[PDB]
Design a protein around this nucleic acid. Sequence first.
RNA 1: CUUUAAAUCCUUUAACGAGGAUCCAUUGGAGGGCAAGUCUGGUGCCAGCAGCCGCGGUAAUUCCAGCUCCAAUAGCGUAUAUUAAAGUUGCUGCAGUUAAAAAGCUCGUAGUUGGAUCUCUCUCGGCCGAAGCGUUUACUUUGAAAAAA
Lengths: 141, 218, 180, 26, 82, 129
Amino acid sequence: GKCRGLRTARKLRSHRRDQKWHDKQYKKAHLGTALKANPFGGASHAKGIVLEKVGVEAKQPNSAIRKCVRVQLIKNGKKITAFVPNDGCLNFIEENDEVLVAGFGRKGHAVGDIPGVRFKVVKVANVSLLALYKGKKERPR
Amino acid sequence: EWMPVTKLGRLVKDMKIKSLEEIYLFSLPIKESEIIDFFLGASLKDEVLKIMPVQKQTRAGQRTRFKAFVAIGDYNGHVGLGVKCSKEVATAIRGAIILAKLSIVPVRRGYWGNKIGKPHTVPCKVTGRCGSVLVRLIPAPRGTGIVSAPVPKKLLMMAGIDDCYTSARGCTATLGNFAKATFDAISKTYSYLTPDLWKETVFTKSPYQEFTDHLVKT
Amino acid sequence: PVARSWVCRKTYVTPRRPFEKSRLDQELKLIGEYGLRNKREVWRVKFTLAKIRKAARELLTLDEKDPRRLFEGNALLRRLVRIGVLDEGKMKLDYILGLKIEDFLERRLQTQVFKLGLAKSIHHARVLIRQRHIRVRKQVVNIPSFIVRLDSQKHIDFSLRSPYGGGRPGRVKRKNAKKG
Amino acid sequence: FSEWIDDLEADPKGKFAQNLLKKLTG
Amino acid sequence: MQNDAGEFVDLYVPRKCSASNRIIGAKDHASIQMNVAEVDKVTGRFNGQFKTYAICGAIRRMGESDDSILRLAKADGIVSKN
Amino acid sequence: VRMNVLADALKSINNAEKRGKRQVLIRPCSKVIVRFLTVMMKHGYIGEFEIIDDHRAGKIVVNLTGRLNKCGVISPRFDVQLKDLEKWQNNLLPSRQFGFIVLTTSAGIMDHEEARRKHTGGKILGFFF
RNA sequence: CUUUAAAUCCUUUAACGAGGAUCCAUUGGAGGGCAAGUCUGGUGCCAGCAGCCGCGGUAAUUCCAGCUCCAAUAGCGUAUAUUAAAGUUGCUGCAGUUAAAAAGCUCGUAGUUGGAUCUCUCUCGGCCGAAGCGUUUACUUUGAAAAAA
């Protein structure tokens, strides 16, 4: 059982701080290896240059092709696969144009049937993908 | 109408049980829901807490039945919870309503601070358990409302509890066990010995004795 | 370094569960009964009542013969009585916990100027207040949320520059009369 | 109420399962 | 069970076991309310009056209901001392 | 070994009352145990008790009424200040209407209501209700 | 030209200023969680939706649109960080037979914990400051001192 003594505060605190390192979120947030391995470097968004378009096959129970783009982040020069969200939005994207890319919503975890894709394209050529999708704005000439 | 089949039912129908609290006082079991219908009448409001399809695997396929969890009770101190499983949803709900009527228990209401006006909360902290679901009810200040999950909130509101504090532990995602644990905690209110109940009991005649002449004379 | 002041405060709190029929129906009942613009006004009145209840509970924890409890509870009860939400007969900390949201929404200038017959309906009361037709004492009040005190209840008049209590015709009446 | 019961008990676990159970009493 | 005005606010006052002085719940169907008939000192007849003992189901299950009722009947003259 | 004999006394009383027994034998006796039992008995929870004197460490035969829901010790004996007593009774007591916390204070061993009346904080021994 | 060191600003008075009061409210959703359509048309495991479970393989309540509806509202969506939720770090307050877990076993110092027991000492005027080794304490509860925002 746990020690219940008036002078056990050091033991209790040391045990708590040692056991916290067995917690997934605490270790990933404080050990530091997760931040280094983060392509964004701890940011929320990142600007990259689209290296190419690519289609990934969805996970087995449901079948489709997800139109992702391989980009290279400007800040750290890493290579990322970012899912272009909607339909026809890959047409809005060309090769070697800067795209603002955010997370997929699961904090580095892959989202849905898409395998190993944890990023989505937010803006292309300095204009949002939503505006292009809704026809509010056009691609700059 | 309704022909009673029990001595208690006959006494209740023959206008000679003053209140439902006599049966609760003598712990007699209710076997006909018409007693509750007669005593609480139109004050009882029922609702279906849950319909759950449960399947038994067979050689030909899966025999699917529906289990209805239904709460009931006038919003003045009496609550009941009933679970009935049958081949059809309507029959299950009817059976659950009948069973919840049969299982009505009196709810004791108490005070958080000063004893002004009608009691509003639970008399004390009370815990109910139903297979790893632990539900704890704590007295709350007047006007707090029922700080609880939706299922315990509905059960406590039907119990007539004006306001309460709730703690839950376990797999409360199983609505049946959550409801049964809340019902257990609510029913444990009148079974808790508080200092104001220390006064020695003055035993009164049981209804099977104080109207035994009416029963025999038939 | 600036001479400014950044002491601000959010006056409402968002419900923990975004969607539930009971709360939504209760809040819409309040909106319809008192003619409010959105749910945030209901949440604001709820937050005010919750702060009052929390202070009352904190005082109620204290000993009855505690100078802080006496002073601050007396001040809070006096303030509640003054704005007309608490009866002078029941002036105790235990009666604060019996206060409801409606007791506070009832004291708004919208509600009071609808209850005084100065407006036909509560929404007419709001559009009257927003259009500067209503005054409290000698001051033209323009905010419907104005919590009318007890000593200003019988002073909600119909302004003096407004055609309803003054007599100068408005833009529409003047423009229509010039075409006679 | 009856139509919801019929839809639920036709396919108690199909596509129209959660919605019908929720619509029953909620 | 009394509010500060002195008014009783309970639905009912539940019975307490005559042995352990613990409340007998509304659904404790194993509880008994025994009536033991009183008897005159010289003729040995039922007087129409009786003494009542309520025993909860917990003791009845444990098997100490017999000793409990025996002690209750000894503590009231119905059973001869020793 | 046997440390904190007050814990053993209170546990024995609690177990004997759970079993519905009319009398419980507590051993060894102690000054703190006797004071705690007296505080219990003033509030009608425990009834009369008798200290058997053997020449080494007394025992106590405690009569029992079914009035005790739970009697418990708090280990270690935390030093509770009068401003922090409300939190302790919120944690330990079933309601504000009944239930007592026993504090050992410079003025003796007494419930939390007496400790608040006498404006004395101390070390929490246990609770009963 | 009130305001202010010329001054745009609220405030004030005045001239125009509203009946698709065109002086046109948006953002996100409508299977469950979670509020709100198994209505219509298109697509046919494609395009896509979907935080999760899951929709889509020609009668899709879930995609693309129309209509309708609900949620907040001059505000709504999204992405990371973080708090509560989390009694999933547990001092309050977790768990360790079988779900993750008791060291193979026993000695052992530090650590933590520890049985009963104790109720002309002293000065001006036949109730006062001084003066205290009461065996030092941890304590409780007062009293000064603990910036302002």
